[PDB]
Coordinates of C-alpha atoms in Angstrom, one line a residue:
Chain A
X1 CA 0.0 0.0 0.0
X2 CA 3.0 2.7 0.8
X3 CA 4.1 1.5 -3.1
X4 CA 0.4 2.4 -4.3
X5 CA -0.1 5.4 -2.8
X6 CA 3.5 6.5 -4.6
X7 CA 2.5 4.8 -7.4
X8 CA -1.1 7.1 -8.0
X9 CA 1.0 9.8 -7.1
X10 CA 1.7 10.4 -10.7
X11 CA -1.4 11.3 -13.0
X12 CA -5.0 9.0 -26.9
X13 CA -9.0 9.1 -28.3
X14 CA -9.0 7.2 -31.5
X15 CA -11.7 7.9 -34.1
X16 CA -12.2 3.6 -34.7
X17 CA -14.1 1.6 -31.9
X18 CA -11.5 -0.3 -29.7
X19 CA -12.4 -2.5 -26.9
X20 CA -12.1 0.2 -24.2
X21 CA -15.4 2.1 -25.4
X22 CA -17.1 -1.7 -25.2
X23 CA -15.6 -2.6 -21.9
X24 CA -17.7 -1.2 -19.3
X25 CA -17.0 1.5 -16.0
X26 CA -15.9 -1.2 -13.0
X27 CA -17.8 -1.7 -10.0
X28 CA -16.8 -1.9 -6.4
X29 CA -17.1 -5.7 -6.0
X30 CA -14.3 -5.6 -8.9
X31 CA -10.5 -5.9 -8.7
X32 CA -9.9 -3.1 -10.9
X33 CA -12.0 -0.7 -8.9
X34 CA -8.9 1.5 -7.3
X35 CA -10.1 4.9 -6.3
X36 CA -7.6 8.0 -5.6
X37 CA -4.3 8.2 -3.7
X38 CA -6.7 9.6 -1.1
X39 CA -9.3 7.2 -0.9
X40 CA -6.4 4.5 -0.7
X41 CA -4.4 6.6 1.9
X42 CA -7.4 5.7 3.9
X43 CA -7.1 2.3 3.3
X44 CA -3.7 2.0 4.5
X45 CA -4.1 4.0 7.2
X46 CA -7.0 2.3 8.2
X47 CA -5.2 -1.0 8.7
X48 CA -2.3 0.4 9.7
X49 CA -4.5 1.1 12.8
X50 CA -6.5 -2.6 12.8
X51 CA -3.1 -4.3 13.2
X52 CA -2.2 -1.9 16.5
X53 CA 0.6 0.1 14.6
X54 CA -1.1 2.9 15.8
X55 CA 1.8 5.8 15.7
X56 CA 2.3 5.3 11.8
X57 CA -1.4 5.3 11.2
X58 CA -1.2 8.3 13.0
X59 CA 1.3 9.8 10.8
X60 CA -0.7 8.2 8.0
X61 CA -4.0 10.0 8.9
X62 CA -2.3 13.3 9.6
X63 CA -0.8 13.3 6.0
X64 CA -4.5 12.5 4.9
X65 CA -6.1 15.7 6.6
X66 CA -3.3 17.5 4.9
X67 CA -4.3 16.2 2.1
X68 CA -8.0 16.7 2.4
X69 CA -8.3 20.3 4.3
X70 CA -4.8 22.2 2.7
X71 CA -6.5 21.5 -1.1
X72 CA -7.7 25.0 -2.4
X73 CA -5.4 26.0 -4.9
X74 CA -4.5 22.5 -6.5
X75 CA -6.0 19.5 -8.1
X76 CA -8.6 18.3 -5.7
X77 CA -8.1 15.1 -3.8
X78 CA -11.4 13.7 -2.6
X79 CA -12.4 12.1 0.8
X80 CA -13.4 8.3 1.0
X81 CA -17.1 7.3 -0.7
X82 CA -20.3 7.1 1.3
X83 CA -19.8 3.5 1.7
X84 CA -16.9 4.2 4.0
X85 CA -17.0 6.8 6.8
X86 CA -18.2 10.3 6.5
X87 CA -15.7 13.4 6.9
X88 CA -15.9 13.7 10.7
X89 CA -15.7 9.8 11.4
X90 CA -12.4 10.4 9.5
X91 CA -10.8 12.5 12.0
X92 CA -12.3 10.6 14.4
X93 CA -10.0 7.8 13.8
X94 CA -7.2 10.0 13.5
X95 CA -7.6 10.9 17.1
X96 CA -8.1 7.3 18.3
X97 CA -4.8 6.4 16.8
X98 CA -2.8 9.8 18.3
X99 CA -4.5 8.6 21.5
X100 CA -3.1 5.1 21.2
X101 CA 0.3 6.5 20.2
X102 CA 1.2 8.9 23.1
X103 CA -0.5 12.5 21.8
X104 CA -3.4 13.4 23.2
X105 CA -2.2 16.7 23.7
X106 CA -2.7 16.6 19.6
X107 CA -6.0 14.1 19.9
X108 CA -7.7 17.7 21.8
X109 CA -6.5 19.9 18.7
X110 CA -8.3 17.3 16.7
X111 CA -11.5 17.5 18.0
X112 CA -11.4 21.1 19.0
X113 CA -11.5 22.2 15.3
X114 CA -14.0 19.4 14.8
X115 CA -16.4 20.9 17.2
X116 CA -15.2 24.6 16.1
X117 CA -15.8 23.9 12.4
X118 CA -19.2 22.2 12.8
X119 CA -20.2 24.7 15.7
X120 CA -23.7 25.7 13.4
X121 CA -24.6 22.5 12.8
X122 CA -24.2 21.3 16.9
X123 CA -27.6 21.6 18.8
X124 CA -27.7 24.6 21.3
X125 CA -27.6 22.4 24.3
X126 CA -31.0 24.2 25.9
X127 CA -32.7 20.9 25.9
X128 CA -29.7 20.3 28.4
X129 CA -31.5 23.0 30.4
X130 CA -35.8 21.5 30.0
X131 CA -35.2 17.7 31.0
X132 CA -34.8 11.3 23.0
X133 CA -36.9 14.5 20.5
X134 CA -34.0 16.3 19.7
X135 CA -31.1 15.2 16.9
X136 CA -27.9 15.2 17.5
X137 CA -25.3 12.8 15.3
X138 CA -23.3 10.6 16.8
X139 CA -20.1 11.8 15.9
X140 CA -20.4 15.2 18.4
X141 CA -21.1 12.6 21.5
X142 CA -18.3 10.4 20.0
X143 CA -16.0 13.6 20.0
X144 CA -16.4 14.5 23.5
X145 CA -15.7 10.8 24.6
X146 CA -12.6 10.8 23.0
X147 CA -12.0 14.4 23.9
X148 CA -12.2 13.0 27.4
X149 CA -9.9 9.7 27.2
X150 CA -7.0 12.2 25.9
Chain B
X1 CA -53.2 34.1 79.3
X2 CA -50.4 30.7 79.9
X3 CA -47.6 33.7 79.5
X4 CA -49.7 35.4 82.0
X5 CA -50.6 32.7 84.4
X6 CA -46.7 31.0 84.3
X7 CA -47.7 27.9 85.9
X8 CA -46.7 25.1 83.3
X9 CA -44.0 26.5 80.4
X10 CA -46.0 27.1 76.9
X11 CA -44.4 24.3 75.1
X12 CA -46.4 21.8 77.3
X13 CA -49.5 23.1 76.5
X14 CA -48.2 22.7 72.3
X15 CA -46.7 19.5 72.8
X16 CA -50.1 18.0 74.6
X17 CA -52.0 19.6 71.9
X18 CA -49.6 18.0 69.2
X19 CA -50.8 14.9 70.4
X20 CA -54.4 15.5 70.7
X21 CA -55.7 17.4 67.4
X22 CA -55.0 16.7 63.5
X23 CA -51.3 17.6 62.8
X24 CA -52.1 18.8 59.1
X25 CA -54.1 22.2 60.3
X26 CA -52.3 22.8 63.4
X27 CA -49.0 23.4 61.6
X28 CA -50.8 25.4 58.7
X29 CA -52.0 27.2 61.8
X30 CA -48.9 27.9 63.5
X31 CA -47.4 29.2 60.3
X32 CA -50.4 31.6 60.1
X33 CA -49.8 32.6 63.8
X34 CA -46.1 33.1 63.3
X35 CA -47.2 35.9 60.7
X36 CA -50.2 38.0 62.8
X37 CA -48.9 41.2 64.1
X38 CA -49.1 41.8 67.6
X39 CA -52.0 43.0 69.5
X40 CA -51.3 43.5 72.8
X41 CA -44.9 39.1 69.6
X42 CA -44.4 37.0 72.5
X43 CA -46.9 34.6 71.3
X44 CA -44.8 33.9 67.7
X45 CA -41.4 34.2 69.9
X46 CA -42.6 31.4 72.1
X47 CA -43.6 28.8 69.0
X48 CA -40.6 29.7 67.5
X49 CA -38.6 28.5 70.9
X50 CA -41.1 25.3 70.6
X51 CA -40.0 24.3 67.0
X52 CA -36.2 24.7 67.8
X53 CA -36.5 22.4 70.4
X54 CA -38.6 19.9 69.0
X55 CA -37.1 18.7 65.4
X56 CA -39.6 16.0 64.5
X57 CA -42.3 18.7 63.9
X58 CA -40.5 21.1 62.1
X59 CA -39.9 17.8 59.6
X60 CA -43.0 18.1 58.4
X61 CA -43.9 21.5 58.9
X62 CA -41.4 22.6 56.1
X63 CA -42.7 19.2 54.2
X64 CA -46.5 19.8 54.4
X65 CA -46.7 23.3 53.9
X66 CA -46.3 25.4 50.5
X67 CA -43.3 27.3 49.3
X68 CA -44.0 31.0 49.5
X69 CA -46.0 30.0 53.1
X70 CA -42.6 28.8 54.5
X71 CA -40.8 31.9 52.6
X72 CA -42.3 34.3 54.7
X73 CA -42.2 32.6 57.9
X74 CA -38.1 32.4 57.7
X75 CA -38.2 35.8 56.2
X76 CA -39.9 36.8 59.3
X77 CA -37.5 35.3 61.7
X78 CA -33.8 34.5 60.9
X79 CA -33.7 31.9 63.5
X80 CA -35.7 29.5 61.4
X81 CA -33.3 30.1 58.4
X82 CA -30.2 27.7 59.2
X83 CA -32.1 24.8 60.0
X84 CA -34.7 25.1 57.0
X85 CA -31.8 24.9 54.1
X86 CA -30.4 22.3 56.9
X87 CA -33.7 20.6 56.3
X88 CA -33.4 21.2 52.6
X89 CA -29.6 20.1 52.3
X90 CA -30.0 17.1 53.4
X91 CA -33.1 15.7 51.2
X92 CA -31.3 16.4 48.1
X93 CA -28.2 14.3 49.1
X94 CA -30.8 11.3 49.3
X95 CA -31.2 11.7 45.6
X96 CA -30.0 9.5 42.9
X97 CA -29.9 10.6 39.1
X98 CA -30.8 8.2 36.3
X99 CA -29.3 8.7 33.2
X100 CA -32.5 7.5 31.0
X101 CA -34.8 9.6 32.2
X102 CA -33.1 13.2 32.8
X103 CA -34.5 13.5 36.5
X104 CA -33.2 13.8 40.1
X105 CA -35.4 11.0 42.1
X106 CA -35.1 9.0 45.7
X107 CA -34.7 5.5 46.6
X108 CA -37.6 5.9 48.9
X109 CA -41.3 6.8 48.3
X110 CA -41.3 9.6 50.6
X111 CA -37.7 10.9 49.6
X112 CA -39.0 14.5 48.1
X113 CA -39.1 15.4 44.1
X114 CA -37.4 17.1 42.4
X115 CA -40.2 19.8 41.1
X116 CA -41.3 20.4 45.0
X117 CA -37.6 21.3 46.1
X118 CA -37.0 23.2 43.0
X119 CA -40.1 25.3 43.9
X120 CA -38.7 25.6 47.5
X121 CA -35.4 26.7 46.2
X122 CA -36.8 29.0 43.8
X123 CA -39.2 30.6 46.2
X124 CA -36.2 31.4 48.4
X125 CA -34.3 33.3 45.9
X126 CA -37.4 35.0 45.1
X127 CA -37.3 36.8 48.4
X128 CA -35.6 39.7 50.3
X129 CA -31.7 40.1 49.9
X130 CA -31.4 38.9 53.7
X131 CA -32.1 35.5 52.9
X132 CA -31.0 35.1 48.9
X133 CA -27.2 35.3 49.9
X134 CA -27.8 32.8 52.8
X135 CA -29.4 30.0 50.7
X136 CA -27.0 31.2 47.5
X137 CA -24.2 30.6 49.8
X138 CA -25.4 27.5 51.5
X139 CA -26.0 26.1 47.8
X140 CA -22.6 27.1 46.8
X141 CA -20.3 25.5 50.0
X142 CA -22.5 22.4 49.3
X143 CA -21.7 22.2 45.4
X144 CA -18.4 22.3 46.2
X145 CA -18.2 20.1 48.8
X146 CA -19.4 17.4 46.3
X147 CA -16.7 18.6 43.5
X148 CA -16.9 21.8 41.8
X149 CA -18.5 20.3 38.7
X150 CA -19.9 23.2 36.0
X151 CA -22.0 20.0 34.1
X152 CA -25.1 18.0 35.4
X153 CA -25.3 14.2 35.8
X154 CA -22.8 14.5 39.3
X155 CA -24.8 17.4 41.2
X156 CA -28.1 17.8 42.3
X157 CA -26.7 21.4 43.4
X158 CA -24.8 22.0 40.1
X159 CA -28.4 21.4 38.4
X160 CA -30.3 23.6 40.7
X161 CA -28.2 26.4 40.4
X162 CA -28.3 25.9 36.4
X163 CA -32.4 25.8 37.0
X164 CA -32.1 28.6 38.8
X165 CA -31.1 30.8 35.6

């Protein structure tokens, strides 16, 4: 996988009909489904973290956020499809693994900006004041657990 | 006309008749009697003596009664103050919170509620400067007493001071 991601680093239309035009777009069951260096970053540093090699997934996942949240003026590199996790499970898992590492001090910055850039969307907390109705997802309770284990 | 006559104390004569009549209106009637203005207020100075002295009364006199009732009275006299939150103080600390449903409650059936001691609470704050320090203050040394928490689930005196406001 640290070959592959290298490897993707890196990024003619014949008027005839060849076999590519006939062969058809691959599915995710398939072996030749291989999405972007991001979406594969993921997947090493996903079981990087599975095994319990837990201070290079964390290296792995910081490279990812870099990846993700420093892409403004560059060609865009995407997040990990809906089948895997959404955005904030991401960084999630990046604060498990600086947790199981040794830097929690870091596993707070985390989910500080977490919380800070999904402030509008977090519920006002007055219900907190009137007491199962509300909504809240379960990644802001899942922050605030980890928040605490750090 | 006992005062007058000063052959048996008072608090004979109030302890027999604690014994004799129905307990419900007698206290509703001493609390009214503690608030008459005199007319001749030795007769209110003399119960009050009575219900320092005897404690199991005064366990259901603040229980029985309503909030603003009880308000007045220990506006009235300052020696009834440190034993009421007293009272108080120690009803909450027989709480336990359950985490499923987002309420205070006891273990036993005649442990208080939370909505009744809330009203108490909030009928004391919503009263003369005297006595809003003095029950602010008593909240405040017992909240920290039991960790000086800023979040409910741990305190019932963290919650009632967030009720509060």
């Amino acid at each position: 996988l640290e070959l592959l991601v290298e490897a993707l680093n890196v990024p003619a239309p014949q008027f005839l009909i060849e076999v590519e035009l006939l062969l058809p777009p691959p599915d995710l069951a398939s072996p030749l489904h291989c999405g972007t260096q991001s979406q594969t970053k993921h997947i090493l540093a996903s079981r990087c973290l599975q095994t319990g090699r837990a201070g290079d997934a964390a290296e792995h996942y910081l490279d990812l956020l870099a990846l993700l949240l420093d892409s403004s003026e560059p060609r865009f590199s995407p997040p990990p499809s809906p089948p895997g996790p959404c955005m904030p499970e991401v960084f999630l898992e990046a604060a498990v693994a600086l947790i199981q590492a040794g830097r929690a001090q870091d596993a707070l910055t985390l989910c500080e900006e977490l919380l800070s850039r999904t402030s509008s969307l977090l519920p006002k907390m007055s219900r907190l004041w009137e007491d199962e109705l509300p909504y809240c997802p379960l990644w802001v309770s899942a922050t605030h657990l980890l928040q605490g284990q750090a | 006309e006992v005062g007058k006559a000063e052959a048996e104390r008072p608090a004979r004569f109030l302890s027999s008749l604690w014994e004799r009549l129905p307990q419900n209106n007698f206290l509703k009637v001493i609390a009214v009697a503690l608030l008459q203005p005199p007319l001749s207020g030795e007769g209110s100075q003399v119960l009050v003596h009575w219900l320092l002295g005897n404690s199991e009364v005064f366990a259901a006199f603040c229980r029985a009664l309503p909030a603003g009732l009880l308000t007045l009275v220990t506006s009235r006299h300052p020696a009834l103050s440190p034993v009421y939150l007293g009272l108080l103080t120690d009803w909450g600390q027989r709480l336990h919170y359950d985490l499923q449903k987002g309420i205070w409650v006891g273990t036993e059936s005649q442990d208080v509620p939370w909505e009744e001691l809330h009203n108490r609470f909030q009928s004391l704050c919503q009263a003369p400067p005297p006595l809003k320090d003095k029950v602010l203050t008593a909240l405040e040394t017992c909240k920290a007493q039991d960790g000086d928490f800023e979040v409910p689930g741990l305190s019932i005196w963290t919650d009632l001071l967030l009720a509060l406001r």
